[PDB]
Amino acid sequence: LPEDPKWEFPRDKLTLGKPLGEGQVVMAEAVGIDKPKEAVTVAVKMLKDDATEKDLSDLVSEMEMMKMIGKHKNIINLLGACTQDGPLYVIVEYASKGNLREYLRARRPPGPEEQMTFKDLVSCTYQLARGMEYLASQKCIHRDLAARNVLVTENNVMKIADFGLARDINNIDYYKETTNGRLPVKWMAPEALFDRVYTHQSDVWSFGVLMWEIFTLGGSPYPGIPVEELFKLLKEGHRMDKPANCTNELYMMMRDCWHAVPSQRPTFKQLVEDLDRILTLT
Template identity: 50%
Template sequence: MPAEFASENDHRDFAGELEVLCKLGQHPNIINLIGACENRGYLYIAIEYAPYGNLLDFLRKSRVLETDPAFAKEHGTASTLTSQQLLQFAVDVATGMHYLSDKQFIHRDLAARNVLVGDNLVAKIADFGLSRGEEVYVKKTMGRLPVRWMAIESLNYSVYTSKSDVWSFGVLLWEIVSLGGTPYCGMTCAELYEKLPQGYRMEKPKNCDDEVYELMRQCWRDRPYERPPFSQISVQLSRMQEARKAYVNMALFENFTYAGIDATAEEA
């Protein structure tokens, strides 16, 4: 953001993100800090370059029925990405989140838009502007909230823990399987506040294996302590990948439709 348009809050968030990156150290599934300097009151941060941009856009660009229908029909596929590649994104993020949670960091804004795709399609967690280095964080001020990715306890009580990050990971896993669909597309935030505590959860995508959906459901359990830790999630996903089964079926079938996208809904 150009300095002349940056608010005091932007500067504070920027400095906060630098502090988090310094404390976290290096990891292959986190966007790593290269260096930082201050010049005439302006703060500059150099982080590693991710040539493929953010994961959300990358997933959406893979929707070949929309971007290259001839390719889709010729190869009988709905995506340029394979089940193995999609699972690898999930493994990468889970591994990075395991590292974060081990260091007792809470991300608080885990979503496909905040994951970057680096060389060799390695997924790297980014955007640590909301991260906190505490086991439990209670948000005391109201700002724009990523409601569609938030756990029940975060929505109701503004409480964030590693287990609320696990809930967000379940939504991110749904984003991966749906090739960048908008979570709860067609529902308002008010409906989510009402329906999630009543037990409503997103349905299983048609192309998703039961085992992957079951993992999502485990991430979305009401009680935080019943959700699996990231260590378990990364092991489970790695096992699936080693099994070489098509856990995410990208083959075209009759009446195939992609999950809906609502960019306006994603802003709230």
Template identity: 30%
Template sequence: MEKKRGTARVLLECSLSDKLCLVQGEQYAVIIVPTLLVGVFLILLAVILWLFIRGQRSQQQRPGRRGIAPMPSSRGLTQEAPGHEGKIVMPLTETAVGSFLRATAPSLAKLQVPRDQLSEVLEQIHKGSCGNLYRATMITGDPPRPKRVVLKALKEPAGLQEVQYFVGRIQFYQYLGKHQNLVHLEGCCTERLPLYMVLEDVAQGNLLSFLWTCRRDVMTTDGLLYDLTEKQIYHIGKQVLLALEFLQDKHLFHGDVAARNILIQSDLTAKLCGLGLAYEVHAQGAISAARTVPLKWLAPERLLLRTAGIKGDIWSFGILLYEMVTLGAPPYPEVPPTSILQYLQRKKIMKRPSSCTHIMYNIMKSCWHWSEDSRPLPKELRSRIEAAARTADDKAVLQVPELVVPELYAAVAGISVESLPFCYSIL
């Protein structure tokens, strides 16, 4: 111990010219100072990383960032502009909606209906995800007289994309023109929000609800006889085919032919509605991946996600005949909706309902050929329908004793109860 203490004392008491003493003293500075600097650097780096990660998490949780956002509203619109590595979200004022409406005004000028010609009191008849349907009164003609119409209103708040789609639908109706078996456009209100389509009012409602009412012992309501015969089925079917022929001439197809998408008048005039798929094909050249149609009405090529066409509508028309002859029964009642493709791949089709004649069943089967080329075109099928109608029974009323339970129907048909058109169909 004494020896160690002596050595330390000698080093501390050495002169400035002693090299050994200087080296021993600088060893502590060389080790301690860098260690402190590295420690401070690591602490600062950890704080910076923590702040960066926190900022990234808050960005991801905030809607409308990183190019993935809910549909922009008219009061907080965004638009995407090309950036160096992708897309940059840029703020867009609601003046973009006004600019768009002003740009489309000349093409829609002849369709504009002054809002003061529409009744202020609106009767809501359907609530949809994109907007509501209202029954209203429009003053028209000279001398002025009231006319019942249906207003389809764009849901608010509405963003630029929703406004463009809505106005595009109006322009699509304008392109189609009028046909006696399509719900036609009476006009529009698009000079400012809220936006309206003004459509003809088919007061009796959709065919599916009519078929369900026919199951009850109802004589007449509002001038409509709730009875259906075989001949009347052909009458309605012929009108649907006329509408499909019209679409085919425009190089379009409907894509969702079903009783729920047909409106019926008191004289059994049928009007095909639900033209959303036809519009998407017209505007985009294809059906949107987000668009869903109940599987049991789809042709095999649609189930296999192949290119669709008018022959797919012919398949669905066969399902429509089944719906009518069974007074609104769901198709393939013994097959779960998710198993319908496998069922059809085994070359199976629906059996003949007891209320269906062999002539009508043969027409159905001609619609259900697996190969599109083996199915008839609308005009050819209409000729067969007209021939069958000449000898069809016009006296015996179709009867189904069971009343429809909506929840059970929806489960078997593969659709939601909320989507059932109890009073009016989506136009």
């Protein structure tokens, strides 16, 4: 593992703290990672003690992907890395309010946190479309888009995270999936699931499932349906019903993302445009 001085952070300027969940992510303090004297609270991703070879490869990949993606307000920011002489540490921006899924479930109405307005939910969907639009413009596919892999910071700012499965598809038409993939089925586009091909329009399908998660306030997709029965249903055109408390306009958008034909689904650019209009209203 060769050294990239641009991102290399000195280990002595980094203090590890409590785990945020468990490879494993821990909270940390990084001095001058931005202001040479200023210490900053960060998140460090690293390997577990029972880590596999694939795990280390994934961690390297995740780091490299975040490099080529670049900065964006709705994407978890790579800050630096400890790659030389010691364990691999991928230092990323810290998220004060955790992942979107638990964040939504905690804000469900009684019958714990203050429940969100409809305008808040649309804003959440709009920010994630913007983040994804930027991602696709960088010719990168996420492959694992879900509420669990979105982090929340500050005043309801959405941040796309978990790029451990992200791929670079620059100069290629599509990504070739293996037979039995590591992608969660209930978020998988049919082309990846059945034809083993993945594009930006496959992320759009996932974004549709992400939308359903947001407006069910952290509900798990295809409720009551085990994945082993989901295969056949998708081949029979099965789609999720409209979540309670959700406009038809936004449900049609979900349905658009769930078109059998990838090109017939809207683009992230088009999703932003429509959501911006919907958000401007409400």
